Design a protein around this nucleic acid. Structure first.
Ligand SMILES: Nc1nc2c(ncn2[C@@H]2O[C@H](COP(=O)(O)OP(=O)(O)NP(=O)(O)O)[C@@H](O)[C@H]2O)c(=O)[nH]1
Ligand SMILES: [Mg+2]
Ligand SMILES: [Mg+2]
Ligand SMILES: [Mg+2]
Ligand SMILES: [Mg+2]
Ligand SMILES: [Mg+2]
Ligand SMILES: [Mg+2]
Ligand SMILES: [Mg+2]
Ligand SMILES: [Mg+2]
Ligand SMILES: [Mg+2]
Ligand SMILES: [Mg+2]
Ligand SMILES: [Mg+2]
Ligand SMILES: [Mg+2]
Ligand SMILES: [Mg+2]
Ligand SMILES: [Mg+2]
Ligand SMILES: [Mg+2]
Ligand SMILES: [Mg+2]
Ligand SMILES: [Mg+2]
Ligand SMILES: [Mg+2]
Ligand SMILES: [Mg+2]
Ligand SMILES: [Mg+2]
Ligand SMILES: [Mg+2]
Ligand SMILES: [Mg+2]
Ligand SMILES: [Mg+2]
Ligand SMILES: [Mg+2]
Ligand SMILES: [Mg+2]
Ligand SMILES: [Mg+2]
Ligand SMILES: [Mg+2]
Ligand SMILES: [Mg+2]
Ligand SMILES: [Mg+2]
Ligand SMILES: [Mg+2]
Ligand SMILES: [Mg+2]
Ligand SMILES: [Mg+2]
Ligand SMILES: [Mg+2]
Ligand SMILES: [Mg+2]
Ligand SMILES: [Mg+2]
Ligand SMILES: [Mg+2]
Ligand SMILES: [Mg+2]
Ligand SMILES: [Mg+2]
Ligand SMILES: [Mg+2]
Ligand SMILES: [Mg+2]
Ligand SMILES: [Mg+2]
Ligand SMILES: [Mg+2]
Ligand SMILES: [Mg+2]
Ligand SMILES: [Mg+2]
Ligand SMILES: [Mg+2]
Ligand SMILES: [Mg+2]
Ligand SMILES: [Zn+2]
Lengths: 129, 314, 123
RNA sequence: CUUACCACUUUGUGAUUCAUGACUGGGGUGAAGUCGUAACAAGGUAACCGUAGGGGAACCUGCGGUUGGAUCA
RNA sequence: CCCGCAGAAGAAGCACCGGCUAACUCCGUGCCAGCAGCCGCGGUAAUACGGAGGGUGCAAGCGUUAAUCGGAAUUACUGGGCGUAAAGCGCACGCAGGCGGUUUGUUAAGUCAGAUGUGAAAUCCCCGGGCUCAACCUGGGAACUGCAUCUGAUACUGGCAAGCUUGAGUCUCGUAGAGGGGGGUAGAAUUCCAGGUGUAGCGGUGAAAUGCGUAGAGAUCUGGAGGAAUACCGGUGGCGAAGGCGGCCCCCUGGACGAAGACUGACGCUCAGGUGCGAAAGCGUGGGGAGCAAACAGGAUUAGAUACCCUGGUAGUCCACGCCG
RNA sequence: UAGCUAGUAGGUGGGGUAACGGCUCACCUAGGCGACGAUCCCUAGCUGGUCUGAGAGGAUGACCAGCCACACUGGAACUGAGACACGGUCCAGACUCCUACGGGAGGCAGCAGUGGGGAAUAUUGCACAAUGGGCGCAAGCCUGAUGCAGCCAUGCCGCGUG
């Protein structure tokens, strides 16, 4: 059964980039909305929108700067089988800081950069490059 | 050195990696063989040397350096292996047959052809006559005489009852005699009876089951005859086929055929159905043993079946 | 595979089997030759290897190789064995220290003398 | 002087362990012996799996199964 | 520690040199003697064995053995795999356990932040200092990645409460199906028995033989008895968790799928142990036994045929109930 | 190696301890522990640390430092602030030693040293001069701790053999 929606969203994005789709659609979620907001802020994804009220759906517009996928690597790090929590100092750096690691801190969901600049540690949702 | 001065010796028996060698003094020892030696069988005469006799209060393995040239030798062709010798420096072979394991006028003829090609003097013995009834004895002798009618020494002996050995003993004295034949015919038991070896040491003897007997003796061992000479126990054999021998050498092997060479109008007379085949009519009037003629033909046609292999036997 | 499986049972490493068990991690041992005999090597090699079967101090009985040309070893000889392995001798995993308290050095050895207990020739 | 606790010990026994061991079962390695050649090509009766019976030996036969089998408009 | 005296005067060995791996030639030997960490060498010019010369490395040491870690991602947390190389239980249900859709509220257990206390000294590291240098000793710092307590943070996981319907399940209406269990029944065919006709062979093989037939075989017709299996349909077809399931009909019964609508409201996934099902062969008891057929009997072939082939033929093959797994 | 446990797990009361407590006893309750591995079996002193490794880890606990346990084997207590006491006591056992056969004596796992085992590991040395410690007002006495020396290429570092 579906036991992790976040990895599902990540793999939907990945397979959409591989199949060169233009827009993907997940069953939305507050957490999914927050992660999508991060990737829109970081210029990873062009835009996102939520429709419906009883069964809301999230829709994402994938980017392709040279026709090649803008997000060339994305992977869930803290999975349900094994959670991952990092303290502020030991927060990771994706591609030596060229990429972005999304972390949920006590002050919401933010990039590793914003987190350690705010001095806050959290669960590492995933790595986006 | 760890070894004694080299000396001449006989090969009492061969067991793969290492053989049994008797020195001129008459003491037998297990001795290794050098890899340069290629062939080494029972009866061979070798130059060897024993090891210094101080290890665990027993003797250490000797080394055999070389073998002397064989005088005579008994070989047999082996598919996948070519012709291989069983025992060398032999003077006489004794074809040992027995009624129970199998009666084979065909194996005896194959052996006769072989020994005729090897110039070794043969002798036919038929073991276990104790099993046959008196009528059956008269039913086996009137075809065992087939060979004694061409001079072959034919004897009938019962190893279990030691019956009629005595002429066999006489014929065995002062010669080197290899006991050959199919497995189960009684070659080991016959040796036990004749040699009268100590009860503690006897050759392996298992009884035959159903159609054919086991292969108990898997070796060829020399034994010193009580009166004089030597015998050799050999492993039983199934097929003494002769594809190595040329087809003419088979016509020569049948001794009852020289009386008719050059009497066939066709000079290249295959003698089967060619017109004017002297031995054809000879066997028509009973001069020749019909069974011998048929055996000659069938072993010839057997050579055609076993000529399939491209290996060489020279 | 799954982390949960590793938790239920951790990864068990592979302990190494010592190829010289009779040594008991001792660099050398002392034994008495109960039997000296000549053996044959594997098919690529042909020779009469001089080996000795030795009863060790710790109760173990093993076969040991004797290097160099010739030996003075016999029954009841107190030799010292060392670890090692002979490829062509199956079941022989020990050498004999040439020059160790019963076995003398090799005669007229001139090179690699220390490997055979041959003192420096007086010159 | 007595009573209680109690180390040692003695039996009746049970369990367990070590050393040794009569007498054996199979195994392994070497291999230049012996008997046949079991498998590899359709290996000359396709091999193999499970099971049962048989046989000096590799093996043979029955039952079901597989292709990890060739040939076959 | 310093000064003085004499004299090069008192002081160099060990391993290796086929590749890995820096270093090569002669002689002896001739699958012998021997070497060897691995591959490996040696049978007549051996750079691999032994000796010599030459060279390479290290040096008051040098080698060998033992032992540990590494290289080894070769137990893979960092950081491995399972179609054929080792590896998916035969299949299913299912307790414990692991994990868990979506919204709101609360809690602060996990988690994060801060503070405090502590984490002996030595040792490790850094900046210095002292032994003529170094080893060594030593000052200060860093570190001791840990633990504990307290105060907060509430995004995520957990707990609590209230929901929601998208997961899961129920209902209504139908469809297809060798799904399963039980009981009847049918038509071919094999064999057997009895009888009718009637002659001399039948049967079998590559060829034969064994075998059956003059009491009449085989052939053909009629009647009967019994057992087992269901040509054609038939399929790259269907059904079942798997093993498996094939004439027709009846009785009982499981699952799947489709349309529309309602209903419940996370009730879910997986599953160590456990339970159940589970081809063929096999075992127990009792029936039944047509055909087939291990074992066995016989005839051929063959050295033999203990096999393949042929003539027979028992267990078994079938049924009931257990067992086997 | 799947069950183990009856002072067993609790309670009340008494006793006992420097101190809480089944620490002990009487009675009462019928619990307690265990698949988050009890019990049983084998192995083992623990740590700071040491070796290796880029790191995570791996191996390990020789020297030095902290803790623990033991002092021929088993048991017990006394004395004392502190012991169930290495060079104290009692008993029992084994062994060794003395014997007048009546009975007695002993404990190097302190420093040297001997035999034995082993591949293997050193002197039956000097001094309390220094630092510690015991006693003493002190002087001072004692100290095989310690400071030094001896032996060993066992290791590291340095130097020479021109
Ligand atoms: N009835 C009977 N049996 C005999 C007689 N001689 C020997 N036997 C038996 O027949 C068997 C023969 O075995 P064996 O002698 O080993 O046979 P082999 O012919 O030597 N050859 P292999 O060793 O290969 O079997 C034994 O059981 C033996 O005792 C005899 O005269 N009569
Ligand atoms: Mg052969
Ligand atoms: Mg025999
Ligand atoms: Mg061929
Ligand atoms: Mg074959
Ligand atoms: Mg075949
Ligand atoms: Mg059979
Ligand atoms: Mg199947
Ligand atoms: Mg080089
Ligand atoms: Mg060469
Ligand atoms: Mg040469
Ligand atoms: Mg050389
Ligand atoms: Mg040189
Ligand atoms: Mg590793
Ligand atoms: Mg792998
Ligand atoms: Mg395979
Ligand atoms: Mg496999
Ligand atoms: Mg499967
Ligand atoms: Mg959730
Ligand atoms: Mg849960
Ligand atoms: Mg904190
Ligand atoms: Mg510290
Ligand atoms: Mg300095
Ligand atoms: Mg919550
Ligand atoms: Mg509702
Ligand atoms: Mg299970
Ligand atoms: Mg069955
Ligand atoms: Mg039955
Ligand atoms: Mg029955
Ligand atoms: Mg048949
Ligand atoms: Mg026959
Ligand atoms: Mg039924
Ligand atoms: Mg109380
Ligand atoms: Mg009180
Ligand atoms: Mg211990
Ligand atoms: Mg590593
Ligand atoms: Mg430890
Ligand atoms: Mg010590
Ligand atoms: Mg002692
Ligand atoms: Mg007191
Ligand atoms: Mg104490
Ligand atoms: Mg004391
Ligand atoms: Mg003492
Ligand atoms: Mg001492
Ligand atoms: Mg003082
Ligand atoms: Mg004193
Ligand atoms: Mg020195
Ligand atoms: Zn003719």
């Amino acid at each position: 059964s579906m036991q992790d929606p976040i990895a599902d969203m990540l793999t939907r994005i990945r397979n959409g980039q591989a199949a060169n789709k233009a827009a993907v659609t997940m069953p939305s979620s507050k957490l999914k909305v927050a992660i999508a907001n991060v990737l829109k802020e970081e210029g990873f994804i062009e835009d996102f929108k939520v429709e419906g009220d009883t069964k809301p759906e999230l829709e994402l517009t994938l980017k392709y700067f040279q026709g090649k996928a803008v997000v060339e690597s994305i992977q869930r790090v803290s999975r349900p089988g094994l959670r991952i929590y990092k303290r502020k100092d030991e927060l990771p750096k994706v591609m030596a800081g060229l990429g972005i690691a999304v972390v949920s801190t006590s002050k919401g969901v933010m990039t590793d950069r914003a987190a350690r600049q705010a001095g806050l540690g959290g669960e590492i949702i995933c790595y986006v490059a | 050195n760890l070894f004694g001065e080299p000396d001449e010796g006989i090969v009492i028996s061969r067991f793969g990696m290492h053989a049994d060698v008797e020195s001129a003094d008459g003491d037998v020892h297990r001795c290794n063989i050098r890899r340069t030696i290629r062939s080494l069988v029972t009866g061979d005469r070798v130059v060897w040397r024993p090891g210094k006799p101080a290890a665990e209060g027993v003797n250490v393995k000797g080394i055999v350096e070389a073998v002397h040239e064989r005088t005579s030798v008994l070989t047999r062709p082996d598919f996948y292996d070519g012709v291989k010798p069983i025992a060398a420096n032999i003077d006489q072979i004794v074809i040992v047959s027995a009624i129970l394991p199998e009666l084979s006028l065909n194996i005896i003829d194959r052996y006769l052809v072989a020994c005729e090609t090897l110039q070794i003097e043969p002798i036919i013995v038929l073991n276990k006559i104790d099993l046959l009834d008196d009528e059956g004895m008269a039913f086996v002798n009137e075809q065992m005489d087939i060979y004694r009618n061409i001079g072959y020494r034919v004897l009938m002996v019962s190893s279990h009852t030691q019956d009629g050995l005595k002429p066999l003993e006489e014929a065995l004295t002062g010669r080197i005699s290899i006991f050959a034949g199919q497995s189960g015919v009684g070659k080991s038991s016959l040796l036990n009876a004749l040699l009268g070896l100590q009860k503690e040491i006897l050759t392996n003897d298992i009884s035959d089951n159903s159609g054919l007997g086991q292969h108990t003796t898997t070796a060829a061992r020399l034994y010193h005859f009580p009166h004089g000479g030597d015998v050799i126990d050999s492993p039983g054999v199934r097929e003494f086929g002769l594809w190595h021998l040329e087809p003419e050498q088979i016509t020569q092997g049948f001794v009852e055929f020289h009386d008719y060479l050059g009497l066939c109008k066709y000079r290249d007379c295959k003698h089967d159905t060619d017109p004017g085949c002297a031995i054809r009519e000879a066997v028509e009037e009973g001069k020749i043993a019909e069974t011998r003629f048929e055996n000659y033909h069938r072993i010839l046609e057997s050579m055609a079946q076993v000529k399939t292999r491209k290996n060489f036997s020279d | 595979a799954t982390v949960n499986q590793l938790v239920r049972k951790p990864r068990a490493r592979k302990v190494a089997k010592s190829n010289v068990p009779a040594l008991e991690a001792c660099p050398q041992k002392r034994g008495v030759c109960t039997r000296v005999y000549t053996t044959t090597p594997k098919k690529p090699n042909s020779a009469l290897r001089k080996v000795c079967r030795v009863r060790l101090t710790n109760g173990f009985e093993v076969t040991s190789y004797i290097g160099g040309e010739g030996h003075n070893l016999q029954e009841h000889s107190v030799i010292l064995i060392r670890g090692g392995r002979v490829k062509d001798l199956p079941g022989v995993r020990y050498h004999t220290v040439r020059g160790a308290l019963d076995c003398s050095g090799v005669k007229d050895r001139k090179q690699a003398r220390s490997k055979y207990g041959v003192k420096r020739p007086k010159a």
